């Protein structure tokens, strides 16, 4: 689609890739709510708190279906590699007031 998923399930924050563009999740917010990256870049969200979070792109944004990411526990991470330019809105599934955007340039 417009993103590929390195790992379908969450992994440890200590195992995050070098050259990784990290967005921290803390205080019930995405710490960088508007992130600008380049085509081919991998973005990694890291949950820093006890409450589970994810990222959720509705249908028609990264592809035909919705991409509802897995729930991340504390100090778990999840990556998306963006393969096409565009503006990609997302929210948190359990907490939809948490909103962010990845702009791929
Ligand atoms: Cu959340």
């Amino acid at each position: 689609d417009k993103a590929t998923i390195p790992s379908e399930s969450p992994f440890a924050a200590a195992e995050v890739a070098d050259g990784a563009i990290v967005v921290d999740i803390a205080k019930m917010k995405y710490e960088t709510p508007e992130l600008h990256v380049k085509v081919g870049d991998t973005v990694t969200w890291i949950n820093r708190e006890a409450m589970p979070h994810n990222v959720h792109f509705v249908a028609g944004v990264l592809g035909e279906a919705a991409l509802k990411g897995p729930m991340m526990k504390k100090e778990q991470a999840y990556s998306l590699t963006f393969t096409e330019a565009g503006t990609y809105d997302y929210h948190c599934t359990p907490h939809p007031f948490m909103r962010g955007k990845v702009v791929v340039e």
Side-chain angles (χ1 to χ4, degrees):
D1 296 42
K2 311 209 178 179
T4 65
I5 303 173
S7 179
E8 296 286 331
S9 69
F11 49 96
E15 302 169 339
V16 163
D18 293 15
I21 296 165
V22 171
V23 176
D24 285 319
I25 311 170
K27 307 170 188 187
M28 302 293 295
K29 76 192 228 288
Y30 303 113
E31 283 200 2
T32 303
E34 187 183 295
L35 178 73
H36 293 249
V37 300
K38 309 164 303 294
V39 172
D41 278 351
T42 302
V43 177
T44 300
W45 290 265
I46 306 190
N47 185 8
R48 304 292 192 179
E49 56 190 7
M51 190 67 105
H53 296 283
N54 77 334
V55 296
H56 186 167
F57 299 79
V58 305
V61 179
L62 286 180
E64 290 80 16
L67 198 157
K68 192 188 288 178
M71 299 311 301
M72 284 173 274
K73 306 285 162 171
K74 192 184 184 326
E75 296 302 315
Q76 292 198 306
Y78 177 74
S79 296
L80 286 180
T81 301
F82 292 85
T83 63
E84 182 172 334
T87 292
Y88 304 106
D89 290 278
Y90 63 96
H91 67 274
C92 181
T93 300
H95 305 292
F97 57 83
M98 301 182 58
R99 305 257 165 185
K101 187 201 314 290
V102 184
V103 186
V104 183
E105 307 178 317

